[PDB]
Design a protein around this ligand. Structure first.
Ligand SMILES: *[C@@H]1O[C@H](CO[C@@H]2O[C@@H](C)[C@@H](O)[C@@H](O)[C@@H]2O)[C@@H](O[C@@H]2O[C@H](CO)[C@@H](O[C@@H]3O[C@H](CO[C@H]4O[C@H](CO)[C@@H](O)[C@H](O)[C@@H]4O)[C@@H](O)[C@H](O[C@H]4O[C@H](CO)[C@@H](O)[C@H](O)[C@@H]4O)[C@@H]3O)[C@H](O)[C@H]2NC(C)=O)[C@H](O)[C@H]1NC(C)=O
Ligand SMILES: *[C@@H]1O[C@H](CO[C@@H]2O[C@@H](C)[C@@H](O)[C@@H](O)[C@@H]2O)[C@@H](O[C@@H]2O[C@H](CO)[C@@H](O[C@@H]3O[C@H](CO[C@H]4O[C@H](CO)[C@@H](O)[C@H](O)[C@@H]4O)[C@@H](O)[C@H](O[C@H]4O[C@H](CO)[C@@H](O)[C@H](O)[C@@H]4O)[C@@H]3O)[C@H](O)[C@H]2NC(C)=O)[C@H](O)[C@H]1NC(C)=O
Ligand SMILES: *[C@@H]1O[C@H](CO[C@@H]2O[C@@H](C)[C@@H](O)[C@@H](O)[C@@H]2O)[C@@H](O[C@@H]2O[C@H](CO)[C@@H](O[C@@H]3O[C@H](CO)[C@@H](O)[C@H](O[C@H]4O[C@H](CO)[C@@H](O)[C@H](O)[C@@H]4O)[C@@H]3O)[C@H](O)[C@H]2NC(C)=O)[C@H](O)[C@H]1NC(C)=O
Ligand SMILES: *[C@@H]1O[C@H](CO[C@@H]2O[C@@H](C)[C@@H](O)[C@@H](O)[C@@H]2O)[C@@H](O[C@@H]2O[C@H](CO)[C@@H](O[C@@H]3O[C@H](CO)[C@@H](O)[C@H](O[C@H]4O[C@H](CO)[C@@H](O)[C@H](O)[C@@H]4O)[C@@H]3O)[C@H](O)[C@H]2NC(C)=O)[C@H](O)[C@H]1NC(C)=O
Lengths: 221, 221
């Protein structure tokens, strides 16, 4: 664990590419007989051996998607970098992967990396044009489609309305669409009031603000 | 697990020698990059590599005590037998050991062996010469000294006495001595009656019977 260096967590976009670093930290007396990357269940996904070469023995993780990032002059003996690159990320690839150097004589040293597959959702917001009334109804809704994980939506308002939302699977498996409706008792003096939809997500370094201006029918400036 | 063949349990006498078999079962596509034997905590105790040779990197388990049992013509490439031999067994060596072949490309396959360190106890039994009385007392005792694990003692009798025993550490750490006293109300008609001490233990394929004949003072044939 302290001997092997990896990222505890790595993020990649669904359909895109990541890299999972892995290095045997020097100084070390040890010698490396082989390195493999395994899933949690122990299934090997990538293998490297100083003589037998490199191999991706699993059909879910072929050479067409996985590969080792060499950063040596094509002539490395010592052999301490096992950085694994992926392309065409799928939902199935999500998981914890073990980078395991088999060394001699003091055995296998291992690091674990959580590979998180993420899907950036599309967001939009709309005012709902309502009529005056006692009936507290939806005056706005925000929609985050195809996120992974699910996007988080909140509202920002000086008025006093409750927000409530619901979920459905997105077009793509692994992805989910969240719909949030802001509701309050529609009084005529509401028309024109700005109300902001706030959506948080991994693929956004800064939360997205989708402002909306309320619309009360038969009443306008 | 199903790929590696080992004994689930092996027994060796304290101060003596055992062997822990381990084989990579054929047929197998795989190639072996190295083999090691580990304790439970992951400490390597024996290591073997097709180029770098053999090594016993741990000071608790030196080459003076451990070794690999080769059964090949000094010219084996394939390399599937990792049988580990021990001598001078100690109490400390008790434990579960993992035989782990690092193979390519489908990773490390492993078998687990419980190494049980056993000490054969010395047993003896004596009649206690008692006097008639209401006082239910000890008329016999059986003693199993220096067993590991603790020996089990029971009595065999046609009379109606209770047996109760006690434990103390033997001279050797890891070993325990059990003392069992058979007691009953000493009536004069008991003298001469055979009563057998039965002691069970691992180092005995058949339970040991130590007969005793009861002795009531001031009363004899
Ligand atoms: C290294 O390990 C790979 C094995 O993976 C581990 O062990 C294997 C045996 C599995 O138990 C796996 O779960 C473990 O993680 C190993 O790959 C295996 O190679 C064989 C043949 O080359 C494949 O068997 C064939 O499988 C398909 C069905 O597979 C589909 O479903 C599974 C999920 O359930 C997916 O993982 C696959 O990607 C597929 O989508 C069968 O159609 C096929 O049947 C054919 O052959 C048999 C005769 O035996 C006939 O009865 C049929 O009519 C067909 O002709 C096989 O059963 C196996 O899928 C494959 N595993 C993977 C992950 O690709 C690999 O070969 C090893 N390499 C070396 C060098 O040791
Ligand atoms: C392969 O691994 C072996 C290490 O074992 C794993 O990692 C080691 C570092 C330990 O953490 C162990 O618990 C793990 O299982 C490794 O063996 C180690 O080698 C060093 C030096 O060669 C040893 O350090 C010295 O230890 C003694 C005290 O050890 C006694 O107690 C322990 C139990 O707590 C027993 O296991 C031992 O058998 C002993 O009975 C110290 O006296 C000594 O101090 C001296 O040196 C320091 C300077 O650093 C000074 O401050 C002092 O004044 C002394 O001059 C060291 O601290 C370590 O015991 C030893 N482990 C074992 C099991 O023997 C081995 O070297 C590795 N081989 C390769 C090729 O990588
Ligand atoms: C891969 O492994 C990583 C990290 O390593 C593994 O998990 C460790 C915790 C431990 O078991 C290690 O041995 C092992 O290697 C996993 O990371 C964890 O992921 C879970 C979610 O599955 C997180 O749990 C969450 O913790 C939050 C507070 O910090 C909390 O808000 C969450 O609670 C809410 O959501 C759940 C519903 O999912 C609900 O039950 C709650 O009541 C509440 O609404 C939740 O408990 C851990 O924090 C993660 N650990 C770390 C260190 O980040 C990862 O899940 C795993 N991935 C896969 C695919 O297996
Ligand atoms: C090494 O590991 C072996 C077997 O493998 C390991 O343990 C398995 C059970 C499991 O955890 C595996 O994952 C792991 O690899 C251990 O074997 C077990 O040893 C214990 C004793 O520590 C046994 O437990 C006993 O079971 C008896 C009935 O079958 C029962 O009579 C015993 O109960 C009596 O004694 C205890 C006091 O010790 C008391 O608490 C009870 O109330 C009662 O008086 C006792 O529960 C298991 O059966 C063993 N398992 C097998 C499959 O044989 C081994 O202990 C371990 N050795 C070391 C040094 O760690």
């Amino acid at each position: 664990d302290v001997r092997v260096r990896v990222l505890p967590e790595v993020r990649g976009r669904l359909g895109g590419t990541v890299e999972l670093p892995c290095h045997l930290l020097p100084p070390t007396t040890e010698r490396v007989s082989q390195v493999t990357w395994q899933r949690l269940d122990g299934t090997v996904v990538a293998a490297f051996h100083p003589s037998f070469g490199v191999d991706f023995p699993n059909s879910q993780f072929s050479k067409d998607r996985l590969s080792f990032v060499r950063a040596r002059p094509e002539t490395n003996a010592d052999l301490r970098d096992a950085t694994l690159a992926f392309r065409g990320l799928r939902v199935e690839d999500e998981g914890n992967y073990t980078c395991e150097f088999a060394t001699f004589p003091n055995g296998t040293r291992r690091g674990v990396t959580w590979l998180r597959v993420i899907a950036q959702p599309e967001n939009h917001a709309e005012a709902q044009e309502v009529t005056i009334g006692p009936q507290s109804v939806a005056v706005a809704r925000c929609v985050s489609t195809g996120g992974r994980p699910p996007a988080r939506i909140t509202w920002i308002s000086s008025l006093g309305g409750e927000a409530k939302d619901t979920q459905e699977p997105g077009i793509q498996a692994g992805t989910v669409t969240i719909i949030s409706r802001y509701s309050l008792v529609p009084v005529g003096r509401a028309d024109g009031v700005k109300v902001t939809c706030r959506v948080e997500h991994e693929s956004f370094e800064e939360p997205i603000l989708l402002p909306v201006t309320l619309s009360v029918r038969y009443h306008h400036h």
